[PDB]
Amino acid sequence: GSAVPFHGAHQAGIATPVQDRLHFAAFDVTTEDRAAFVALLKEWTAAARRLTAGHAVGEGAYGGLPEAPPDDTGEALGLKPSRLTLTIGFGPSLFTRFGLADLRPEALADLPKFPGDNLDRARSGGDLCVQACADDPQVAVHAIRNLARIGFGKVVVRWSQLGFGKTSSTTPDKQTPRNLLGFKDGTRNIAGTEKDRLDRFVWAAEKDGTPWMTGGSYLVARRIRMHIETWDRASLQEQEDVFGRDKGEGAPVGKAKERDEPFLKAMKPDAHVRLAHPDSNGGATLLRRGYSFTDGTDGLGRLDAGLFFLAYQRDIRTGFVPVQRNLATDALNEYIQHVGSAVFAVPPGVRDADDWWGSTLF
Amino acid sequence: SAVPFHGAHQAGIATPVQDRLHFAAFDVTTEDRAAFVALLKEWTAAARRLTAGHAVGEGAYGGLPEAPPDDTGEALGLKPSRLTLTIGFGPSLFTRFGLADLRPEALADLPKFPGDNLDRARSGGDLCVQACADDPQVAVHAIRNLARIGFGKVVVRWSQLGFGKTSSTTPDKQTPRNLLGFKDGTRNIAGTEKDRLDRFVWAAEKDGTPWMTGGSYLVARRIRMHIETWDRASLQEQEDVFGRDKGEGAPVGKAKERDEPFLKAMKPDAHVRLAHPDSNGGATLLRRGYSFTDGTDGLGRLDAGLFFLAYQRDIRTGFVPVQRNLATDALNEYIQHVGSAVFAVPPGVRDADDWWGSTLF
Ligand code: HEM
Numbered sequence: 067g068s069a070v071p072f073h074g075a076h077q078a079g080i081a082t083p084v085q086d087r088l089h090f091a092a093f094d095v096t097t098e099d100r101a102a103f104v105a106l107l108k109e110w111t112a113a114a115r116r117l118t119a120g121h122a123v124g125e126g127a128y129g130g131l132p133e134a135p136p137d138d139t140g141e142a143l144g145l146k147p148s149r150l151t152l153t154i155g156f157g158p159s160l161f162t163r164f165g166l167a168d169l170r171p172e173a174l175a176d177l178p179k180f181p182g183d184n185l186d187r188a189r190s191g192g193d194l195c196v197q198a199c200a201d202d203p204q205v206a207v208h209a210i211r212n213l214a215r216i217g218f219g220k221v222v223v224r225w226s227q228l229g230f231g232k233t234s235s236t237t238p239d240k241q242t243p244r245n246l247l248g249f250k251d252g253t254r255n256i257a258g259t260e261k262d263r264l265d266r267f268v269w270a271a272e273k274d275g276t277p278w279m280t281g282g283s284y285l286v287a288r289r290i291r292m293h294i295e296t297w298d299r300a301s302l303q304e305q306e307d308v309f310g311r312d313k314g315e316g317a318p319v320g321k322a323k324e325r326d327e328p329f330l331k332a333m334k335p336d337a338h339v340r341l342a343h344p345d346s347n348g349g350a351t352l353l354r355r356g357y358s359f360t361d362g363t364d365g366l367g368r369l370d371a372g373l374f375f376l377a378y379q380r381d382i383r384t385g386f387v388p389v390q391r392n393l394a395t396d397a398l399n400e401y402i403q404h405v406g407s408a409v410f411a412v413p414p415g416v417r418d419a420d421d422w423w424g425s426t427l428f
Numbered sequence: 429s430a431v432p433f434h435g436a437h438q439a440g441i442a443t444p445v446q447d448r449l450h451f452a453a454f455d456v457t458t459e460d461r462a463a464f465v466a467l468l469k470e471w472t473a474a475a476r477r478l479t480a481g482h483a484v485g486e487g488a489y490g491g492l493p494e495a496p497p498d499d500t501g502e503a504l505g506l507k508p509s510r511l512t513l514t515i516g517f518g519p520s521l522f523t524r525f526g527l528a529d530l531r532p533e534a535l536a537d538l539p540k541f542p543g544d545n546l547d548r549a550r551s552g553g554d555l556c557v558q559a560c561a562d563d564p565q566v567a568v569h570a571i572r573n574l575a576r577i578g579f580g581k582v583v584v585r586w587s588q589l590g591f592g593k594t595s596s597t598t599p600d601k602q603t604p605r606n607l608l609g610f611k612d613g614t615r616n617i618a619g620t621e622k623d624r625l626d627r628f629v630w631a632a633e634k635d636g637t638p639w640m641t642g643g644s645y646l647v648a649r650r651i652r653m654h655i656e657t658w659d660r661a662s663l664q665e666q667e668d669v670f671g672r673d674k675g676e677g678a679p680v681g682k683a684k685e686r687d688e689p690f691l692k693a694m695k696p697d698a699h700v701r702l703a704h705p706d707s708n709g710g711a712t713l714l715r716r717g718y719s720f721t722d723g724t725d726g727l728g729r730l731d732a733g734l735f736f737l738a739y740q741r742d743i744r745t746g747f748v749p750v751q752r753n754l755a756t757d758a759l760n761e762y763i764q765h766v767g768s769a770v771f772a773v774p775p776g777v778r779d780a781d782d783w784w785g786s787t788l789f
């Protein structure tokens with residue numbers, strides 16, 4: 067239940083160990099005054115320093131003047147930090163404002179249309195986002211609510227997504243979680259310890275072209291519905307064929323252990339692992355950090371389930387795009403549908419107590 | 429780590445409150461009494477497996493490659509996580525299978541209450557399964573697999589995820605706070621109070637419905653909070669609405685949370701004052717609800733609130749009088765009841781040969 071440090075060269079919440087719960091929100095900016103927006107960023111950074119340490123924002127949740135609303139809404143009182151991280155990102159549409167056009171990064175590429183895409187524009191896009199991750203879902207909701215509260219009149223929430231449980235791993239020494247299809251998810255990811263792999267595949271460099279993004283990353287979010295009725299009547303062999311790993315151990319087909327290296331030629335030509343593997347993609351590698359969700363029924367007598375997929379990479383054009391292009395023939399496509407999409411530039415870390423979110427851009 | 433499944437009562441009522449909830453209401457699609465009893469027996473077998481941390485049937489893997497696995501497998505490698513599974517029967521169940529005359533009188537239809545805004549789609553249900561656990565994935569896997577086993581005989585009508593405390597970081601003796609920032613649960617029936625459970629919670633034989641002896645009656649209300657409006661109210665307005673201060677949760681005029689309230693020092697329409705048993709002829713409830721946050725609606729607003737669950741010996745003498753007395757609650761300014769259901773929760777599964785609903789069928 068400890069705290070994750072808030073300051074660093076990079077923002078926490080990426081290479082950090084994946085916490086149990088997600089509350090992700092996308093925001094549209096509603097002010098034209100760039101000075102007001104910078105003031106917002108400074109105030110949000112100050113709140114996040116309190117929040118990530120387990121402190122109430124402002125002057126606290128009670129004890130102030132009776133006739134004023136309290137600074138902090140109060141529902142996280144007496145809770146530990148719970149490994150809360152807060153990660154902010156800037157959407158492509160933001161750079162149409164405040165005179166930022168010339169500063170939008172080349173690596174903040176718009177996604178092309180992919181086959182099967184059925185994207186809902188209400189749950190897509192966003193001028194910016196905040197990814198709140200914690201082991202306690204009340205801690206995460208409290209942080210989103212209080213950021214939105216502070217930004218009233220300058221930002222509004224466009225759409226949000228709660229993940230009730232992780233389906234990713236940055237800690238290969240810990241148990242790999244399973245997604246709602248019942249398969250381990252996260253075996254061959256990037257570990258928060260693999261410093262060289264993060265430099266090569268995740269962190270933006272100065273040489274890459276955009277100096278203010280040095281130390282940041284780029285985020286692709288995809289809301290993906292699962293056809294669980296269809297999946298749940300498929301045979302065990304069909305399910306294992308679709309992925310290329312067995313269901314129980316999660317081992318590559320033909321091998322004994324989850325972490326044995328896959329031998330791709332033994333997998334079906336349309337197996338998900340075979341098609342997603344860096345070797346099939348010229349070395350393209352992603353940091354996967356997604357969460358499972360369920361949002362009630364579908365109105366047709368079934369549960370509604372899916373995966374809120376999040377990938378961090380050094381450059382959307384050499385990471386998510388080529389891999390997703392190679393999944394056009396994926397056998398998994400029969401059982402899923404992408405229904406929400408958004409990309410963000412995640413800026414560098416807040417260096418110390420005088421720094422603030424987005425300072426290198428603004 | 430696990431909660432015993434068998435008992436004179438079903439678990440998940442008086443047993444310790446777990447961190448997470450997945451509540452599902454089901455509608456019945458079969459007219460065949462025999463087919464329904466068959467499913468009740470199949471569900472009970474699955475509940476025994478699930479609550480002990482085992483896969484249903486012949487497992488999540490290792491069976492024939494050309495068959496679908498008996499268990500969908502997303503709980504593999506997880507612990508029992510204090511999973512309890514509690515089943516209830518809705519009044520509409522008793523229009524089927526010839527059971528009309530077996531409906532308990534204590535399973536009363538709720539009156540319409542001032543300010544109700546009930547979504548038909550997220551109300552009612554032929555039956556329900558309350559799945560409580562410290563791991564949300566354990567709870568979801570339980571609902572997911574019972575619905576699968578029942579496919580063809582029942583459909584899921586509506587489902588609600590909820591959270592309370594996170595036990596792995598919050599002390600056990602600490603009152604949780606609801607999403608309005610106030611401690612919630614201070615004056616409640618505790619599972620340790622066997623005499624209050626007999627008086628206020630468990631159905632007795634002389635209550636008039638023998639098959640329900642050892643059962644209870646459940647009211648579910650999905651209560652939206654108007655978060656953004658609440659958060660612009662002054663600290664003094666918030667405390668006036670409840671009759672307790674926000675920091676400590678002490679009744680006005682006292683200094684400790686568990687000090688007994690002086691009701692005359694609260695505002696006349698304070699929530700505690702109107703809800704208290706002394707203002708309702710002694711009517712007392714076991715509250716066992718969970719917070720929810722489902723996302724954000726079309727106007728940018730937080731879709732969040734309290735999934736209110738109350739157990740009582742008779743709906744007519746528990747939930748109805750108290751909710752009636754809330755007609756003028758100052759809290760009504762900030763909440764809206766948007767979903768509702770009632771259920772008869774049968775007595776417990778006595779042993780390995782017993783099954784859910786055996787006393788009724
Ligand atoms: C509901 C949607 C998806 C599900 C259920 C799913 C599931 C899985 C599973 C079970 C594995 C094997 C274990 C592992 O190494 O993590 C895996 C691997 C992987 N997946 Fe997916 N996946 C989904 C979507 C995606 C998408 C959209 C992408 C990229 C656009 C992707 C990229 C990858 C990659 C890169 C690997 C690692 C393969 C390797 O390097 O060995 N997945 N996925």
Ligand code: HEM
Nearest residue numbers: 606610611612613614615651700703704705734750751763
């Ligand atoms: C969003 C909806 C509600 C919220 C946030 C809420 C909150 C609270 C709070 C903070 C307390 C004081 C602490 C405690 O004793 O638990 C309380 C007490 C109580 N509430 Fe509510 N409540 C809600 C709805 C209801 C409803 C619908 C009922 C019953 C119809 C109810 C019945 C009670 C009772 C019986 C008490 C105990 C009073 C006593 O004996 O001191 N509440 N509630």
